[PDB]
Amino acid sequence: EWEALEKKLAALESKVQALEKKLEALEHG
Amino acid sequence: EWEALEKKLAALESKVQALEKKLEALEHG
Amino acid sequence: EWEALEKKLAALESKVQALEKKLEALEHG
Ligand SMILES: [Cl-]
Ligand SMILES: [Cl-]
Ligand SMILES: [Cl-]
Ligand SMILES: [Zn+2]
Ligand SMILES: [Zn+2]
Ligand SMILES: [Zn+2]
Ligand SMILES: [Zn+2]
Q1: Structural contact between residues C13 and B14, judged by C-beta atoms closer than 8 angstroms
Q2: Are A19 and B19 in contact (CB under 8 A)?
Q3: What is the distance between the alpha carbons of residues C20 and C23, in angstroms, rounded to a whole number?
Q4: Which of A9, A16, A27 has its CB closest to that of C15?
Q5: Cα of C12 to nearest chain B Cα, Å
Q6: Which of C1-29 are b and which e, b meaning 16 or more Cβ less than 10 Å from the residue's Cβ?
């Protein structure tokens, strides 16, 4: 259970970073 | 508290999926 | 470890509010 919760948080952290990257590209590119 | 944390992570998941789909729309005009 | 997860979760909540707002702006030019 603990490992699943860490994995999910880690995955969410990567998804925000991907989304901010893409937003910046759309705004400025 | 564990259960509150899991709900919060599920909320966050629902919100980044929504935002991903929004960004996609923006990418296509 | 638990405390750290909670702080990371709060951080992420702030980040997705920020990105939600930014995306609302970009949607409207
Ligand atoms: Cl566990
Ligand atoms: Cl595309
Ligand atoms: Cl702890
Ligand atoms: Zn596509
Ligand atoms: Zn496409
Ligand atoms: Zn709106
Ligand atoms: Zn509008």
Answers
A1: no
A2: yes
A3: 5
A4: A16
A5: 8
A6: eeeeeeeebeebeebbeebeebbeeeeee
